[PDB]
Design a protein around this ligand. Structure first.
Ligand SMILES: [Ca+2]
Length: 301
């Protein structure tokens, strides 16, 4: 009796929609919900002063105008940065290109008017607390990040910080995960009432050998392909559902962000997709009349 098996089909904005909007910004998130996304996917790191901010990389270089590790800088240092400084529609964030490539560079900083309905703070690195305040009713998928693949304490620390904040909200409509299994395990010990999805080790043990993942796991969040191996296949998704696990599929290089690819995944009975183009997926789901939570529609299986 797992309520996430009934939550389908989900349009989960990947970082708010990294190809249609500046990733991990209050703008991208607010936009993504207005377009009808069922859930927000985001990434969290911590500042020098133990503040959980929403940002994927461990450095601010790629998505902003600054430099250095997030853990190395004040929250006030990082809130001043232009979090759309390198955003190009259809290409996420690529620095070092002609300045007219970036339609939102400069609105955070005050040199260009914000789009109708938004203020400059909507284009900075936000506190996770701010996002939770802005979306009290919207479910949030939260991935724990670290500063390096060898710096395991940094993951463990963010998991400690995340459990505290999330316990204070008294909400349980989250899914918390990370690539680092220890970090998920540490989070599950400190916040046992928050749903989780396993790390790579848990994922591989379940996928390659059938070892059921950590208790409290309520979905598997998988790429489409991994090192040449097709992961989001109907046969695998059939097996996960049989064991009582929802399946959410992300892309981010492992497969295109296509109409065709999205449709393959929908047809494979995935319960949620994590698109870089969430507006696109909405159009696809609406045209196909696919069932959504609380909305009538057809089941692809
Ligand atoms: Ca992520």
């Amino acid at each position: 009796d797992n309520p996430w098996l009934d939550a389908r089909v989900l349009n989960m904005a990947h970082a708010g929609g990294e190809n249609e909007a500046p990733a991990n910004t209050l703008y991208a998130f607010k936009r993504a919900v207005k377009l009808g996304a069922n859930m927000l996917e985001l990434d969290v790191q911590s500042t020098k002063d133990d503040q959980l901010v929403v940002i994927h990389n461990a450095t601010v270089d790629q998505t902003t105008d600054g430099t250095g590790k997030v853990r190395d800088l004040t929250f006030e240092q990082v809130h001043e940065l232009d979090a759309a400084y390198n955003f190009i529609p259809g290409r996420h964030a690529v620095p070092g290109e002609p300045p007219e490539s970036y339609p939102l560079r400069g609105v955070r900083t005050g040199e260009k008017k914000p789009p109708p309905g938004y203020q400059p703070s909507d284009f900075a690195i936000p506190k996770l607390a701010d996002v939770l305040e802005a979306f009290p009713r919207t479910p949030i998928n939260i991935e724990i990040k670290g500063t390096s693949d060898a710096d395991i304490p940094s993951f463990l620390h963010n998991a400690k910080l995340l459990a505290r904040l999330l316990k204070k909200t008294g909400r349980t409509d989250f899914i918390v995960t990370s690539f680092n299994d220890l970090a998920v395990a540490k989070f599950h010990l400190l916040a046992p009432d928050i749903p989780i999805a396993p790390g790579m080790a848990g994922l591989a043990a379940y996928f390659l050998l059938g070892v059921k993942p950590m208790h409290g796991t309520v979905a598997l969040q998988i790429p489409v392909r991994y090192q040449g191996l097709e992961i989001a296949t109907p046969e695998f998704i059939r097996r996960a559902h049989a064991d009582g696990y929802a399946v959410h599929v992300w892309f981010s290089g492992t497969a295109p962000d296509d109409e065709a690819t999205y449709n393959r995944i929908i047809d494979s009975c995935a319960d949620g997709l994590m698109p870089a183009y969430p507006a696109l997926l909405e159009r696809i789901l609406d045209e196909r009349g696919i069932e959504r939570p609380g909305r009538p529609g057809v089941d692809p299986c």
